[PDB]
Amino acid sequence: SHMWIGVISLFPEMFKAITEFGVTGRAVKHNLLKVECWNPRDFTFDKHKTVDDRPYGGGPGMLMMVQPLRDAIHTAKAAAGEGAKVIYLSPQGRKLDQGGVTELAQNQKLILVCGRYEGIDERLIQTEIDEEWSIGDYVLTGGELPAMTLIDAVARFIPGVLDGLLDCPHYTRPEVLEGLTVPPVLMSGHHEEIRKWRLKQSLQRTWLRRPELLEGLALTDEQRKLLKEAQAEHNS
Template identity: 40%
Template structure:
């Protein structure tokens, strides 16, 4: 899969995808990351990419022309690309979206806004989807874009060293993932559930299921009610 970041600050993104699991995925050819900087497409003699908001308001907006030219260049080179804008007003990005995009797309374009955001007309003209990653406003769209790309990329075949890691994860079946433990068996007076040490996988699975339900009820009662409704 190819993921393109449309950003004024590619250096923010580049370091993250050059390390660890995703870095190895890129080296192995499972994932391709590239960047398009709207500043390179600005027709302003000073390469200006922002302007004041019409009608007043604090801060600046990204200007339409550089961003449109950048997106048109991407479309011309990759007509099948799916363009995703990141915005606090978008629909919440879910694990189901990550699975859908990982399974159906070959080229994703993540548009990361800056300043006070992006001229709404650009979103209406070019967005295939608009995502938010939480009820918070950040200084730019790079972090949300990286979050979405990471969630998609780890689902691609060959990216994770152990594909079984994807078998039972948070948000599958509307439940949070059950707690996990490693050695030692006792740490600061807290012991691992004894049944986990006996190797009876059916019992371990049943206990983890109960723990997942309890954890979801405590941390995410909204998901808990959703999971109960599916029973």
């Protein structure tokens, strides 16, 4: 299932970071992921290609100018055809988590609008945007890194591109590293013991680092047992 993502950004060249490198770069080269960018600067008509404008009511900051942004969005929507969801990345949006990534990945077409300055006119959110999303409770200089982050996350769900708990520890060569050894179970070749060890480690690490994540899970019988074991060993 091909995925198409339209991007609206004053800095389209930033997106080379995902389209030219790594797993996402491969997805693009192999036509599994298409990323198409429109720059509001290209939709300006004045001599200096003005893309910002003053906020009504005053204030220190600027907003994105409505007309070039609106025209870029409309062009992206035309190219997308039917069924594209338009996403605005902002701190006031729905907070992204893996469940949310899974939801967004169900779309074959997305348009991502990247805000700069103090953001965009509220009426454009009403008239052009379908959903607002945040990548976390922190503040950035633009919506491009959030857009790139979202693209990377949803790209993992495209066929051919590649449980709620934190990952277990992993080990590779050498057998001894600054005096630290590899857990003997991992060298035992006993697949079941190894699986159970990894699962128990994941449960232990989730409990110690992010206990609230556990509360949101319905643990299996096996997970309940291994978690109890890990907690017992912790209190020993």
